C-alpha cells in the first residue's frame, strides 16, 4: 500500500507535506479541544474564528553551523506579531490554543549530525547573577531564535539570561530534557520533526502577554560534519500553527 | 502489581523486536524474552513504596526561627513560602503542576541564655502561634490588639506535652499549586519575574504568652509540611545544580557528572 | 468515665506516622478539580522514560555537549574495544545523573531489568557492526572480544533502522540490590566491541558518534525510601 | 459506621478506620491507590508502532 | 483497662476547633424562641443589598453629604469623562467602606459578578444619555470615549424610568480573586462617558447630580476568614 | 450551592431589564446575561465559609486580668460583659438581635516576680475561677467563706496541663441577648441610658488555691468567647468609627472613606 | 445510637458522631446549614415587579 | 403591561437602551443572515467571529446647530478603524455583512426640530 515515511498535514488554508518524517508525537496523550462548559470560569462568551487564527506560520531560519550550541523560542511570544492570531491576542485579556510544531532541517546523505527538539512547559530561566532576574528582552525574542552558549555566562550584575547549554538555562542536566515530548531529527534518517502540544496550564484561561506557557528548544547533540564539496549552509525552519484558540474579554488594543 | 516473565524458546524470524527507530520519540519496551531465552518467574514483587503519595508523604522541616522572653526581638515573623529548605523544595520541583493538603507540626524548644540573674524561678513557658492571611493587620509589637484572633486561627501550647498539629486544606485561587511560572506581574512585562509572582499565601508569626522568669529564655521553632491526597502534573527533569536564592531558580553552572579515568575504566 | 491506659509510645512526634487532625480552617470550599494533560500516578512511569546516558564523563568533557557522545571511527585493526561501565545505576558515574539514576538514588533497594537504546548517529552511506555485551560477576572485566563474547551479547547492525536495544536482565542471587556499592551485590559489566568495521565511501567523514539511553523493564520495583545524598544547604536560602 | 479494608502484608487481616472530623480535609492520607498508565510518557507516538515490526517501513 | 495512645497534637488549644463539653449549667430550661421578624441564615443576603458608593471622595467631600453625588452639567464638547474607579471591592477607598466592602474585609478571597445601580437625580425635564464602560486589564486606563468603546459598555438614556444597572461580569483567569491588592488578579477598570450631552429647558438647572449603588449578584462566593484591618484598640475599653 | 449563569443570544425587544426604578426600594436581580452575551458556566462553587454559625464560631479573647500569690491584689473580679474588645463586639453589632450559646476557655499564665528572697522553691501553682450570678455573695477578701461554692459553679486547674473549658446555655430572661437597647431604666426617662440597661450577667473571679513559695509569683488569667448554635435577626450597618467606652455607643466623627486624587483616578 | 453524616469535600467519605453529654447544649456546633432566602432584604416590595418590565408603568 | 416606546438591543458584549424610541425599521423586510452554500461562489473556508466583529462601535458625535446642512457617513470606511471589524477587514479580500443604525440626538420639551436619518444604498456621487 503506502509507507509510514510520507505525510500531509492541512490546517485553515496552509499544508505541509513530508516525504522522510518519522511518526507524529501528540503531546502527552491527548489532542487539542475547546474549552468544555463543565471547566470555564469566565462568563462571557467567547470568539472562535478557528481560521484566520489557526494555521501554519512559518518563522525565521537560522543556520546549523559545527559551533551553534542550540535555540530557544516562546510560543505565544513568536507568533504576537504575525497576522490576526497576533491581532487577536492583542485586542483580547484571555487566550486559550495548542500548538502544532514542525521543525525543517535537510541535508545530503553524505551530511551527519543530529537535533533533539523539545517542547518545555513552563521553562523558568536563571539570570546570570543570582541577585538579577532575566529582563523582558534578552529572555523572550518576537519572531527571532535566542541562541544559547558553550561557556558560562559572567556572573557580573547584568540581567542577562544563564544561556549554558549543557545546563539549559533552567538549571538542569540537558541528557534528562527527554521526559518532555521531543522528537530526534537524525541526518542519517529523519528530516523533519513533528509535535503536538496541548494547553498545559494550571488555570482554565491566561493572559498570553504575561505568561509564555511553552518554550520550544532544539539542541545539537551531535555536531553536524562533511567534507569539503558539500554544501555549508544548512538552515533550520520551524513552522508553528495555533489549533483550537479562542478569547475572551475584548478591551482596547494593548501592546 | 509487577508484572512476570514469559518464558521463551530459540527462534529464527525476520521480524526483529531489538532493532526500532529511536527518532520516533518512542521507548521501544523490550522484554528480556525478545533478546535471549528466559524461564517463567512469577513476580509477586510491588510497586507501593513508589506511588507519589508515599514518595511525598513524609514531614519535612521548612524554616526554624528564635524568639527571646525579654529583649529586642520578643516575637517572630515568618512569610510561609516553601523553597527555603533544599529537602523538601527538591522533591516538590519533580513535578510542574502539584496539588496536596497540608499537615503542621510545630516543635517549640526552649532554653536558658547565659545572664547574671539571680534568684531565678523557671514557669511553665506558654506559646502562642498565629496566621495572617494575606491582607490581615500585622503585629507591629509583641503585646497589642492584634494578638485577640477574632477571626484568624492560632493555637496555644504549653510546655511539657506533645506538640502541636493542625491540617490546611488546599489554599489557591487556581486549581493546582504552580512550581514554575514563566512570567511577570505586569503585563508590561516589566517587575516581579518568576515563582514568586504566585506567593501570596500569609504570614505566621509567634510569642510567648507569658514571661516565665526573671532571667532570659530563647525559644526556637521549627515547622514541618506533611503534604496529604496528593496529585501530581507534568513530570520534570531533577534539579541537578545546587541552590542560590529562594525567590527565583537563578544558579550557577555546574558540570553534567562526576568524572572517571578514562572510557573504559569501571571503577569512579 | 471509660478507664483507659497508655502505652508505651505515646506523646511522641513520629516523622512517617498517618493520624487524623483538627483542621484550622472549618467547612473550606475547595476549587474544583480541572483536566490537566499528563497526570503522575507512579514514579515508575519516569523511570521507564529513555534517558541520555554521560558516557563520555572523562576530564573536562563533563563541561561541555561531549559528554553523551561516544567516538567510533574507521579503525586498521578489529576486535578493540569501544567503551564498558558497571552495571551500578545508583553509584556509578555513568548512571548517577541519568533519570533512572535520580529515582534510584531516593530508594535504598531496586530490582528488574534494564534497557540501553543505542543509536547510531553517523553518515546515511557509514555502514558498521557492534557487538553489546553483558559480563555478570565472578571473573575480572572481559579485556578482549574472545572473552566478552561468552556472556550476554547481542550483534547490532547499522542500517535503515537506526535504534538497538540491549535488554540488560535480571541474573542475581538476592531478590533486591543495593543502590549503594557494596562488593555482596556486585551487578556485572556492559562492554561494547567492534564486531566487523565501520567503513565509509569517498568524500564522507569517517569518524561518528553514538548515542546510548537508559531506561527501566516493565518488572521494575524500588523499596525502602531514603535522603538523596546529591542536594546541600549551608543556611537556609533566603 | 466503620469501614473495613485489607491492610498490606507480604506475599506468597483486616483492618478498621472511622472518620471523626468533619471536614473531609482531616481524613488520613490515602496510600493505597496502585493504578499506573505509562502510556502518556513511553510510546506517546499518535500511530500504534507493533513490537517486531520495521519502526520505519 | 484500654490501652490507648496518645497522638501528635494533644492537650492543645486550636482557636477554630469543634469538640464537645461539660456544661458548667446542668438541666437548664432555655427560654423559648419567637417569631422576629427578619432573621439572616447567610452573610451573602445582605451583600445583595445596594450600598450607596462615595464616588466622590476628593479632599473634604468625604466630611459631608457631597460624597455621595456625581456631580454632572451640561457641557460645550461630547465625549468627556464624568468618573472612572478600578474594580477593587476589598481594596480601594471607593469600595472599602460599602456593605459589599465590608463584607469583603473579612474574607481574603472573593468570586461572581457585580451590580452598579445608577440613578439620575436631576430635574424632569432635563434629558441625557451616558455610556457606562468596564474594560478587562492588559492595557491601561482609556482615555477616549473611543477607547472604552470598545469594552463592555450599556448606553443609558435618562427617562421616565430613573434607574439603570451595569451587571460588571466575571471575566478572570483564576476561579477567585483576592481582596487585597495584587497584580497578578487584577480587576479591570469602571468609566463613564458622556454620550451626547445633558439638555435642559429655560429656567432649569443645567448642573444636576447621580448617585450609584453596589450589590452582589446571584453567583457571590467568599472564602478564608481573616480579620478586619479597620477596627482597632489601644487598651481594654472601660 | 452558587447559581449557574445561563447561555443567551443576540436579543433585540421592547423589553428592557437594565432600566428599572430604585425609588421603590427594590434590589433588581440582573444576570449578567441580560447585558450581554454569555456562555454557559456551571459553578461548583460553595457559600459554606458565609453562613452566620461559620462567620461568629470562632475563639476571640474578650478580657485578660492579673493577680498575684502574695500581695495587695490577691484575687481578680470581672463583672462579665462583652464590649470590651473591639475586634469580636464589632462582629457581634452586625446584627440587632443575637442567639447563642458559648463556650469559654481561659488561659492562665503564671510569671515570676522580681525580687530579693532567696531559696526559692518553686510548687505546682492550682487556680480557682469562680462565677457569682447577679445577687449571690461577693468574696471581699481572697480568703472568705464564699470561695466554698456550694451552689455556684466553678473549675480548680493545676498548672501543666491542658487549659480549662465549660459550656454555657443561653441565659437571658428575654427571648434573645439584645445588643442595642434604644431606652432608659427608669420609666421617668432620666437614669442608666443605653445597652448598660441589659447586662446584667453576673461576675467572675479567680484565686490561688496555694501559695506557690517564697517568692512572689503572678498570673494572668484570659477569657475567650466561643458563640455555638447561633441565630441572628435584623441585620445592621458595620461600625465605621472606632469604640470610645464600654458602657455605651459614644463616639467620635469620623470621615465616610479615606479620600484619593480626583474623580477619576484609579490608584489611592 | 451513632449518627453518620456526609464530609465536606470539593467537587467534581461519611463521618460517625456521637452525643455523651445529656444537656442538649454541649453538642459540637452545627455547620452545615447552607439554607437562604434573601426575598427579606432584597425586592421585599408588596407588589410583585418581574424583570423585564417598566417598573413604573 | 408594557408600552412599545421604551427598547433594549444587545450585541456581543454592548447594550442599547432607549426610553422614547419610535418602531424599529427592518430594511426590505429582510434580517441579515449568513451566506447560504446554494449562492456562494469563494471555495474557501470562510471565518466568522460573531462577537468581536458584530458589537456596537460609538463614532464621534457632531454639533447640531441652527444653520447647519447635514452629514453622511460611508458605513464600511467609518468603522475601517475600529476594532477587530477594522483588522479583519484589513486582513482578508472578501467580506460580507448587514449593519444596525443607530443614531442619539436629545432635547428638552423646549426644544424643536426634525431630522431625517435615511441608508442609500449605492450613493455615487
Ligand atoms: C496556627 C496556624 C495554623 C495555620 C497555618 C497555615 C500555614 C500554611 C498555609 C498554607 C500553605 C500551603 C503551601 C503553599 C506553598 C506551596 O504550595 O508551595
Ligand atoms: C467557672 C465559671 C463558669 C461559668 C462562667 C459563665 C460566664 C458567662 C455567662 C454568660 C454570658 C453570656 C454572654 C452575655 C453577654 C452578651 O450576650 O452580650
Known amino acids: 500500500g503506502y509507507s509510514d515515511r510520507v505525510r500531509s498535514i492541512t490546517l485553515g488554508n496552509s499544508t505541509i507535506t513530508t516525504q522522510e518524517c518519522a511518526n507524529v508525537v501528540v503531546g502527552y496523550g491527548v489532542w487539542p479541544d475547546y474549552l468544555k462548559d463543565s471547566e470555564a470560569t469566565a462568563e462571557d462568551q467567547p470568539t472562535q474564528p478557528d481560521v484566520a487564527t489557526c494555521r501554519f506560520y512559518t518563522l525565521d531560519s537560522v543556520q546549523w553551523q559545527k559551533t551553534s550550541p542550540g535555540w530557544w523560542w516562546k510560543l505565544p511570544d513568536a507568533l504576537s506579531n504575525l497576522g490576526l492570531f497576533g491581532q487577536n491576542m492583542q485586542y483580547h485579556y484571555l487566550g486559550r490554543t495548542g500548538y502544532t510544531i514542525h521543525v525543517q532541517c535537510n541535508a545530503s546523505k553524505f551530511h551527519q549530525g543530529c537535533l533533539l527538539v523539545v517542547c518545555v512547559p513552563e521553562a523558568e530561566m536563571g539570570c546570570a547573577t543570582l541577585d538579577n532576574t532575566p529582563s523582558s528582552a534578552e529572555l523572550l525574542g518576537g519572531d527571532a531564535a535566542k541562541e544559547f552558549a558553550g561557556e558560562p555566562i559572567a556572573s557580573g550584575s547584568n540581567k542577562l539570561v544563564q544561556r549554558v547549554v549543557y545546563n539549559a538555562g533552567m538549571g538542569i542536566g540537558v541528557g534528562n530534557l527527554t521526559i518532555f515530548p521531543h522528537q530526534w531529527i537524525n541526518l542519517r534518517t529523519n528530516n523533519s520533526a513533528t509535535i503536538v502540544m496541548p494547553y498545559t496550564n494550571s488555570v482554565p484561561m491566561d493572559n498570553m502577554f504575561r505568561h509564555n506557557n511553552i518554550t520550544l528548544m532544539v539542541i545539537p547533540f551531535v555536531p553536524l560534519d562533511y567534507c569539503p564539496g558539500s554544501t555549508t549552509y544548512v538552515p533550520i525552519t520551524v513552522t508553528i500553527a495555533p489549533m483550537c484558540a479562542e478569547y475572551n474579554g475584548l478591551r482596547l488594543a494593548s501592546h | 502489581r509487577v508484572a512476570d516473565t514469559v518464558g521463551t524458546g530459540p527462534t529464527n524470524s525476520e521480524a526483529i523486536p531489538a532493532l526500532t527507530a529511536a527518532e520516533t520519540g518512542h521507548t521501544s519496551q523490550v522484554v528480556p524474552g525478545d533478546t535471549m531465552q528466559t524461564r517463567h518467574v512469577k513476580n509477586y514483587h510491588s510497586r507501593s513504596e513508589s506511588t507519589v503519595e508515599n514518595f511525598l508523604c513524609r514531614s519535612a522541616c521548612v524554616y526554624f526561627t528564635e524568639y527571646k522572653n525579654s529583649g529586642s526581638k520578643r516575637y517572630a515573623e515568618w512569610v510561609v513560602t516553601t523553597r527555603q529548605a533544599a529537602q523538601l523544595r527538591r522533591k516538590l520541583e519533580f513535578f510542574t503542576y502539584i496539588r496536596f493538603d497540608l499537615e503542621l507540626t510545630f516543635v517549640i524548644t526552649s532554653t536558658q541564655q547565659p545572664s547574671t540573674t539571680q534568684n531565678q524561678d523557671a514557669q511553665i513557658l506558654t506559646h502562642q502561634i498565629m496566621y495572617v492571611p494575606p491582607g490581615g493587620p500585622v503585629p507591629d509589637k509583641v503585646d497589642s490588639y492584634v494578638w485577640q484572633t477574632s477571626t484568624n486561627p492560632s493555637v496555644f501550647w504549653t510546655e511539657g506535652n506533645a506538640p502541636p498539629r493542625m491540617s490546611i486544606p488546599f489554599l489557591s485561587i487556581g486549581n493546582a499549586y504552580s512550581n514554575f511560572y514563566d512570567g511577570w506581574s505586569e503585563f508590561s512585562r516589566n517587575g516581579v519575574y518568576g515563582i514568586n509572582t504566585l506567593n501570596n499565601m500569609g504570614t505566621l508569626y509567634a510569642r510567648h504568652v507569658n514571661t516565665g522568669s526573671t532571667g532570659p529564655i530563647k525559644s526556637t521553632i521549627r515547622i514541618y509540611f506533611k503534604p496529604k491526597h496528593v496529585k501530581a502534573w507534568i513530570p520534570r527533569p531533577p534539579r541537578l545544580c545546587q541552590y542560590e536564592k529562594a525567590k527565583n531558580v537563578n544558579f550557577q553552572p555546574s558540570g553534567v557528572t562526576t568524572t572517571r579515568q578514562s572510557i573504559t575504566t569501571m571503577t569512579n | ?238 | 459506621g466503620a469501614q473495613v479494608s485489607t491492610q498490606k502484608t507480604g506475599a506468597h487481616i483486616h483492618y478498621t478506620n472511622i472518620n471523626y472530623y468533619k471536614d473531609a480535609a482531616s481524613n488520613s492520607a490515602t496510600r493505597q491507590d496502585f493504578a499506573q498508565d505509562p502510556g502518556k510518557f513511553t510510546e506517546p507516538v499518535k500511530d500504534i508502532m507493533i513490537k517486531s515490526l520495521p519502526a520505519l517501513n
Not at chain 3, 586498521?76 to 569501544?82: H, P, R
Not at chain 3, 534497557?115 to 575480572?140: D, E, I, R, W
Not at chain 3, 557494596?182 to 556485572?188: N, P, Q, V
Not at chain 3, 523499596?223 to 536560602?237: E, V, Y
Open chain 3, 1 to 238: 468515665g471509660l478507664p483507659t491506659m497508655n502505652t508505651p509510645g505515646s506523646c511522641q512526634f513520629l516523622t512517617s506516622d498517618d493520624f487524623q487532625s483538627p483542621s484550622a480552617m472549618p467547612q473550606y470550599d475547595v476549587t474544583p478539580e480541572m483536566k490537566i494533560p499528563g497526570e503522575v500516578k507512579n514514579l515508575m512511569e519516569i523511570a521507564e522514560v529513555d534517558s541520555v546516558v554521560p558516557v563520555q564523563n572523562v576530564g573536562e568533557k563533563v563541561n561541555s555537549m561531549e559528554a553523551y557522545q561516544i567516538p567510533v571511527r574507521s579503525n586498521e585493526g578489529s576486535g578493540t574495544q569501544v567503551f564498558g561501565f558497571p552495571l551500578q545505576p545508583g553509584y556509578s558515574s555513568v548512571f548517577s545523573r541519568t533519570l533512572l539514576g535520580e529515582i534510584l538514588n531516593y530508594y535504598t533497594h531496586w530490582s528488574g531489568s534494564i534497557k540501553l537504546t543505542f543509536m547510531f548517529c553517523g553518515s546515511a552511506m557509514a555502514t558498521g557492526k557492534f557487538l553489546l555485551a553483558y559480563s555478570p560477576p565472578g571473573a575480572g572485566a572481559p579485556t578482549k572480544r574472545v572473552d566478552a563474547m561468552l556472556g550476554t551479547h547481542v550483534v547490532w547492525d547499522v542500517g535503515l533502522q537506526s535504534s538497538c536495544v540491549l535488554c540488560i536482565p535480571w541474573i542475581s542471587q538476592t531478590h533486591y540490590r543495593y543502590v549503594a556499592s557494596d562488593e555482596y551485590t556486585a551487578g556485572g559489566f556492559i562492554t561494547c566491541w567492534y564486531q566487523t568495521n565501520i567503513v565509509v565511501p569517498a568524500d564522507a567523514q569517517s569518524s561518528c558518534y553514538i548515542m546510548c539511553f537508559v531506561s527501566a523493564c516493565n518488572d521494575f520495583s524500588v523499596r525502602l525510601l531514603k535522603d538523596t545524598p546529591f542536594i546541600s544547604q549551608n543556611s537556609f536560602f533566603q
